[PDB]
Each structure stands twice: as C-alpha cells, then as structure tokens.
XYZ file of C-alpha atoms in Angstrom:
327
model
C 94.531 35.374 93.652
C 93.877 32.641 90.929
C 96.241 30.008 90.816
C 98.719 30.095 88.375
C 99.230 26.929 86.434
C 102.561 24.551 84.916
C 101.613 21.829 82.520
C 104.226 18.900 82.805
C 104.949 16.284 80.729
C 103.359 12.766 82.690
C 106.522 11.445 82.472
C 108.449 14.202 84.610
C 105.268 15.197 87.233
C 106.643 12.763 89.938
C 110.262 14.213 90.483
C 108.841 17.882 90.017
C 106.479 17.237 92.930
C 109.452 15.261 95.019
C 111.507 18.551 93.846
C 108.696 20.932 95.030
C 109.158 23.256 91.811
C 105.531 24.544 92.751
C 106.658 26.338 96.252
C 110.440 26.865 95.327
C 109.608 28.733 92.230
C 107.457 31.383 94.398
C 110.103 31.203 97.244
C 112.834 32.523 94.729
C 110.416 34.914 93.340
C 110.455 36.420 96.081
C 113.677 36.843 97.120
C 114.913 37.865 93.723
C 111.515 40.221 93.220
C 110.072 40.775 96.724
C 106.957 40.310 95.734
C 103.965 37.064 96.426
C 102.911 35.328 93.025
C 100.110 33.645 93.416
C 100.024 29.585 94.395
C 101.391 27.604 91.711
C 100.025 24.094 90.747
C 101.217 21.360 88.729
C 98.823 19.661 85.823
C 100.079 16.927 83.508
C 99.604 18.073 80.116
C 98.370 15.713 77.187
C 100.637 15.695 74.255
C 103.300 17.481 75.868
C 106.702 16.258 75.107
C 109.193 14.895 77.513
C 111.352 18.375 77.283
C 108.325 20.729 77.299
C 106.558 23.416 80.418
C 103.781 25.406 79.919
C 102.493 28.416 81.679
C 98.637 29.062 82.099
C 97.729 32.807 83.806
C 93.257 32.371 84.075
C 94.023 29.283 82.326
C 95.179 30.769 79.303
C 98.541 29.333 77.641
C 100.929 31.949 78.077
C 104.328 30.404 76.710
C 105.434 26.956 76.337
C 109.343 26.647 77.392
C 111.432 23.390 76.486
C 113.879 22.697 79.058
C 115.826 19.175 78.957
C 115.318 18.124 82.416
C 118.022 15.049 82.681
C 120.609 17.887 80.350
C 122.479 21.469 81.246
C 122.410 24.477 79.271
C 125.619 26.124 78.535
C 125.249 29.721 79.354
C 127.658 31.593 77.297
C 128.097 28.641 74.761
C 130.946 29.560 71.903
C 131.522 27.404 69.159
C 134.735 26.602 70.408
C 132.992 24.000 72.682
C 132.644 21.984 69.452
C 136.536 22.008 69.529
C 136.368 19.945 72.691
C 134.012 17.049 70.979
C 130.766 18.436 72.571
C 127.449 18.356 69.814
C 125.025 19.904 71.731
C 121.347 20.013 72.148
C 120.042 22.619 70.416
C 116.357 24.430 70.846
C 115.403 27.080 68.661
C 112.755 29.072 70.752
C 112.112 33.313 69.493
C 115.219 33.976 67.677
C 117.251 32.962 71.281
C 118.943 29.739 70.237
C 119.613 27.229 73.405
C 122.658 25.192 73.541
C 122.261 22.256 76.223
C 124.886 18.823 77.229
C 124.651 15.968 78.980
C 126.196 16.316 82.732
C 129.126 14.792 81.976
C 130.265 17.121 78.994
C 129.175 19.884 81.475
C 131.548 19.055 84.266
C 134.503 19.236 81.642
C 133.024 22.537 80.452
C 133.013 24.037 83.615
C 136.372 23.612 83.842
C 137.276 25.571 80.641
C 135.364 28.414 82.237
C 131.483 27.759 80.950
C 128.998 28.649 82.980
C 126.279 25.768 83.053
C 123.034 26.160 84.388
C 120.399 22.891 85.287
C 116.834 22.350 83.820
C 115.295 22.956 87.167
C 117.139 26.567 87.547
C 116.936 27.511 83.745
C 113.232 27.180 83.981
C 113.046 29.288 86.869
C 114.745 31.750 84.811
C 112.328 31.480 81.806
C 109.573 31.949 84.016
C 110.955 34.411 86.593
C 111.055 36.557 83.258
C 107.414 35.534 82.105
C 106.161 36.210 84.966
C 107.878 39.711 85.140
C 106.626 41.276 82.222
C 103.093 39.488 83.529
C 103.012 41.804 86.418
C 99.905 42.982 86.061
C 98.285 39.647 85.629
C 98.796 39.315 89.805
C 100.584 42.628 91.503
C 98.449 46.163 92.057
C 96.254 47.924 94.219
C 95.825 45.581 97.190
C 99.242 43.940 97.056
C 100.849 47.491 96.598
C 98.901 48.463 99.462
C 99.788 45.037 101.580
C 103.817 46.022 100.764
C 103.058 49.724 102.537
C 101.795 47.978 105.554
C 104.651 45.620 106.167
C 106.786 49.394 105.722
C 104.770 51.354 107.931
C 105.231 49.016 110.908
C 108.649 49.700 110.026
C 109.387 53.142 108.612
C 106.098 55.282 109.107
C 107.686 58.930 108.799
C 108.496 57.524 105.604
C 105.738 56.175 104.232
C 103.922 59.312 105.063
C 106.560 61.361 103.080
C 105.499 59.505 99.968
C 101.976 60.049 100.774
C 101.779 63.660 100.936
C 102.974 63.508 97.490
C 101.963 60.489 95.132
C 98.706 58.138 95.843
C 99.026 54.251 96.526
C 97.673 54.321 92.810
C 100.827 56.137 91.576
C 103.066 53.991 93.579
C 101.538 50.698 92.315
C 102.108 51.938 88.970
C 105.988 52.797 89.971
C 106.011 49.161 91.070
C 104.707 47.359 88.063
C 106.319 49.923 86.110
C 109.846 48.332 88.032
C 108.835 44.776 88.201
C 107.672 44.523 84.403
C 111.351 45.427 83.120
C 112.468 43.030 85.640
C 113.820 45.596 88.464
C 113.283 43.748 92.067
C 111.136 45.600 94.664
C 112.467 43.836 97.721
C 114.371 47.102 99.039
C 110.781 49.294 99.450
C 112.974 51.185 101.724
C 115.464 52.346 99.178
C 112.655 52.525 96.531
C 110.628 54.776 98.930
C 113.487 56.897 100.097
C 113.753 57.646 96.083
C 109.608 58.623 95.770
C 110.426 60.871 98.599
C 113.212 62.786 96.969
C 111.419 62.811 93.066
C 107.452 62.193 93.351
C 106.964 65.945 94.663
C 109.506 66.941 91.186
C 107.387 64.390 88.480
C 104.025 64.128 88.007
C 104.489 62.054 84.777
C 104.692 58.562 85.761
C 106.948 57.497 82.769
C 109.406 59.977 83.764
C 109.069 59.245 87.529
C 110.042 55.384 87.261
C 113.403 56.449 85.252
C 113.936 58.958 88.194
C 113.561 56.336 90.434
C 115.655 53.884 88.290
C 118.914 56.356 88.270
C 118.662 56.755 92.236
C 118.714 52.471 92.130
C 121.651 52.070 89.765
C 123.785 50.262 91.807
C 120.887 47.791 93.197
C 119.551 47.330 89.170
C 123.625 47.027 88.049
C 123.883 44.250 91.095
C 120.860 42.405 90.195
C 121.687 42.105 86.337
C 124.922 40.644 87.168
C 123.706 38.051 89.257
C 126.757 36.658 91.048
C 128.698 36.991 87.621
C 129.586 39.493 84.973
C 127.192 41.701 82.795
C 126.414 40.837 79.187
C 126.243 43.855 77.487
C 125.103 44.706 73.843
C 125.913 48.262 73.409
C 123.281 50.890 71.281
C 126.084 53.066 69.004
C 125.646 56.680 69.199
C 124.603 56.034 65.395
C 121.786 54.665 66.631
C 121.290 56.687 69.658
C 121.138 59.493 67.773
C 118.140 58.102 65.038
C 116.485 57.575 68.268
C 117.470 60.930 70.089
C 116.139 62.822 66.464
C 112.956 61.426 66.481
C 111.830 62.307 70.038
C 108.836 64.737 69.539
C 106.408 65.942 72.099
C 102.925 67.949 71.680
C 101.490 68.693 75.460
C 101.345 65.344 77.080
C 104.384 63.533 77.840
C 107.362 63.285 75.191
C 107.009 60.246 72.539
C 109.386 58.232 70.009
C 108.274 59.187 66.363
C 110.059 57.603 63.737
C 109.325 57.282 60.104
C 108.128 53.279 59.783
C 111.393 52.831 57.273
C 113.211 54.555 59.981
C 111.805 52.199 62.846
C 111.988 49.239 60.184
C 115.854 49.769 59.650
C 116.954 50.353 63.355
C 114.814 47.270 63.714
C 117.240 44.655 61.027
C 120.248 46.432 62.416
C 119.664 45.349 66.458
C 117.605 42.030 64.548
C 120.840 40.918 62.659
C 123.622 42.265 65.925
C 121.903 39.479 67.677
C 121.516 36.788 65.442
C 125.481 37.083 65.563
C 125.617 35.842 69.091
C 124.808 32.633 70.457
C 123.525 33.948 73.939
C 120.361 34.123 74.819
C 118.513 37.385 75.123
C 117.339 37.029 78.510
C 120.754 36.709 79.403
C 122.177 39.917 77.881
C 121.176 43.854 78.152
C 121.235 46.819 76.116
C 122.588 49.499 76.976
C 121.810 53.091 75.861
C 121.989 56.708 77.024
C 119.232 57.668 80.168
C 117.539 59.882 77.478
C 116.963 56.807 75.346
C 116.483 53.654 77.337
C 112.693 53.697 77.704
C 112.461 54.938 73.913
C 114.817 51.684 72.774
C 112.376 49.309 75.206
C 109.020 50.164 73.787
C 110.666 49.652 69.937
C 111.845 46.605 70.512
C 110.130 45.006 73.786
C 107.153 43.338 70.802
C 110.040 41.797 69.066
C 112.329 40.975 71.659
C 110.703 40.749 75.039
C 113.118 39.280 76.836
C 116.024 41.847 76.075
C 115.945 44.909 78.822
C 117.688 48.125 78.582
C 119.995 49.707 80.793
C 121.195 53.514 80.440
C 124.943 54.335 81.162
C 124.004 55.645 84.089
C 122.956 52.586 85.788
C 126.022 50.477 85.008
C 128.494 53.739 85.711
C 129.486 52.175 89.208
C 130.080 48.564 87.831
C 132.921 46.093 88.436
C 131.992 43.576 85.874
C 130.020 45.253 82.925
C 131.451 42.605 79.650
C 130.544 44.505 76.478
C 130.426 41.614 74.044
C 128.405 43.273 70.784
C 127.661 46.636 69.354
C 124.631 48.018 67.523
C-alpha cells in the first residue's frame, strides 16, 4: 500500500485525532465494503478553511469535501423546514446542494421526521463513495487473491468451482467491477456461489458482473437502504426506450450509440429532474430496466458520479423502495 492522505483544517486536527477518524474510517470501510483500504493519515492543510477535508490518493488531490464539523446535515431537507424558522447552512458542491443546522434546530427536526446526519458520519459518507469509485487506486490482484485465501480456509470446494472456470484476474475484475458502483464484497460466499452458477455461461466480463448483480438483489436492495427507505429517481420508459434504441453491437460486446443531440438531450432531461430536488445524489438511485442500467451509468457516471443505478430487478423484493422523482 501507500498511505492514503486527509488534509484538515489546523484548527480541527486535535479532536479528529482524539476522535480517531484515521482508523474508524477504514474500520467502517470494511464492514460496509469488506474490503482493507490502505492506512489513512492525517496532515494539516495550509489555507484550508475551518469547514473543509481533502483527499490525497499518491499525494494527488482527489476531492475537497466541506463538512461543518460543530453543524448537522439534514438528509432529506424540504423547504418546509423553513416553515419551522430553520435558515440553514447551505454548500453548493457538483450540482448536489447541502443543507446543514446547528444541533439544536436538529433535535426539533428530528422530531418532525428529518433524518440528520453529523459531520463526522457525513464525511464518512463522502469518502466511503470517493473511495468506491477509486477502487482501483488500492484493490486488485494481490488483495483479490488475499480475499480467496481467507475463503479457502473456509469454503475450498468452492473456491475451486470458480477456478475451473474464471482466473483470479477475472474475479478481481468482478470485484472492482462491484466495489466501483458501490456494491459491498463482504459476503465472498454469496458472491462466489453466484461465479459458480454464471462464470462457466459469460465470458464477457461486463455482462458477467450484471449476472452476478441480479443473483445479489436482495443484498444490493439491503445495502442501498441502509437502515431506512430507498430514494428512488425513476428512468421513464420514454427514456428507457431512447436508450434501449440505440444499443448496437458489431462482434465484441454490445455498446450504447446515441446520436451526440440524442445523448445531449437525455442528458438536460435527467440534468434538470435533479436540479428539482434538494437531495443529494449520493443519497438517491436510479432506477432502470436490467437491459439498461449499465448503459444509463456509463452516460451519466462523468456528470454525475455519485448517482448509481439500480435495475427493477434488484429492488423487486423491497419493503421500502420511496420513488420520489421521474425522468
């Protein structure tokens, strides 16, 4: 590993330290993930703002985040909180807009039904997402093959099933392929179980990994939700079906091929659906047909990084999906 690295304002480095964000962060990441970042390290960075992180991966900035430590940030903020005397903080960060009160104005909030979140958690959440889509930055070959270890001392039958039929290359790939849309790999078992059944069937990676994903529906559905319910933008079949029309393929694998107009339109439609709601991306999905989903992430991932995509499929045996916005 190299280390990777949180610049902190001066003026905060003490209590983050006495908090132990370094270790906590990675402890987290690996129960929500199941994987090992790297060590983390704190730096005080010059010129950085009381309200202001920033992430370093081989010492190059990666994102600055502005969390207001001594604030909380209202999760599913409406304006109706204004109705209650409450002015918030507001950050303006991508075209997410962040919504944050003191702890007092939270506790009355909480009480109307917001969910508030603290800095210390939100920034977890900001960098738990980061540091998802950074996968490859510090999870393949070796770590993929440290994971089968811990499984074969376990469940060797099993790992040999997936051997016979995809390389610890391919399943690396499956596992970055996961991690980098922000699917957790702590269940190798079930994950495994799944290789078994489709890596003999697919030989295409891309299709393989949405294979995989339908056989962990219920454990992606579960994980989206946290302990709460699922924010849902829905993709209209209007839209679906721009998508679904453009699909081409020439011998290789199957491809998205839209006019740029085409791409360009579909693009100010989901770009204007979401300037309508106050929620953060992160905190909402997409969802979309299984033919579609990986089309609908690649169009809009440079955009909108933080917004995943769920198909139908994965949310068909949910409680709690909340459909809040169409597209």
């Amino acid at each position: 590993t190299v280390p990777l690295i949180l610049l902190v304002p001066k003026s905060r480095r003490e209590d983050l330290e006495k908090a132990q964000l370094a270790e906590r962060l990675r402890s987290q990441f690996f129960i929500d993930y199941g994987v090992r970042l790297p060590e983390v390290l704190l730096r005080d960075g010059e010129g950085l703002d009381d309200n202001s992180i920033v992430l370093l991966i081989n010492e190059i900035r990666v994102e600055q985040f502005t969390v207001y430590f001594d604030l909380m940030r209202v999760v599913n903020y409406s304006d109706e909180v204004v109705s209650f005397g409450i002015n918030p903080t507001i950050h303006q960060q991508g075209s997410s807009q962040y919504f944050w009160v003191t702890h007092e104005e939270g506790e009355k909030l909480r009480e109307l039904g917001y969910v508030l979140r603290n800095a210390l958690d939100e920034l977890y959440h900001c960098l738990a997402v980061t540091l998802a889509r950074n996968v490859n930055e510090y999870f393949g070959i070796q770590e993929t093959k440290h994971m089968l270890d811990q499984l074969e001392a376990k469940f060797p039958d099993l790992l040999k099933e997936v051997l016979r039929h995809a390389t610890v290359q391919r399943i690396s790939e499956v596992l970055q392929r996961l991690l980098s849309e922000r699917v957790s790999v702590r269940n190798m078992k079930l994950i495994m179980e799944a290789l078994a059944l489709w890596a003999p069937r697919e030989k295409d990676v891309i299709n393989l990994v949405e294979h995989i994903r339908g056989a962990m529906a219920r454990y992606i559905c579960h994980k989206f939700a946290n302990g709460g319910e699922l924010r849902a933008v829905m993709v209209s079949a209007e839209v679906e079906d721009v998508i679904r029309k453009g699909i081409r393929q020439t011998s290789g694998s199957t491809f998205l091929s839209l006019d740029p107009e085409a791409s360009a339109n579909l693009m100010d439609l989901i770009t204007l659906k979401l300037d309508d709601l106050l929620i953060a991306h992160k905190d909402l999905v997409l969802l979309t047909s299984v033919d579609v989903r990986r089309f609908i992430k690649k169009m809009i991932e440079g955009r909108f990084p933080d917004l995943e995509v769920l198909s139908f499929g994965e949310i068909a045996d949910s409680k709690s999906v909340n459909v809040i916005k169409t597209i």
